[PDB]
Amino acid sequence: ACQCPDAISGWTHTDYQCHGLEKKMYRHVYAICMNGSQVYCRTEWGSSC
């Protein structure tokens, strides 16, 4: 869930970290907009930790 005013130009994601409460891997996916701004798209979840 993310949208740029005009268009998405780029894609990036933060490092997987250990969720202290959920006990699973998580990281944040970010879109880069044409205007330079970044938007939080989705949280990705992985294996137990």
The CA distance from 16 to 45, in Å, is 8
Query: Are the beta carbons of 46 and 28 closer than 8 angstroms?
Result: no
The CA distance from 19 to 6, in Å, is 34
Beta-bridge mates of residue 43: 28
The least distance separating Br ion from the CB of residue 30, rounded to whole angstroms, comes to: 9
Of 24 and 42, nearer to Br ion (C-beta) is 42
Site for Br ion, rule CB under 5 A: 4-6, 12-13, 15-16, 33-35, 41-42
The least distance separating Br ion from the CB of residue 44, rounded to whole angstroms, comes to: 9
The least distance separating Br ion from the CB of residue 1, rounded to whole angstroms, comes to: 6
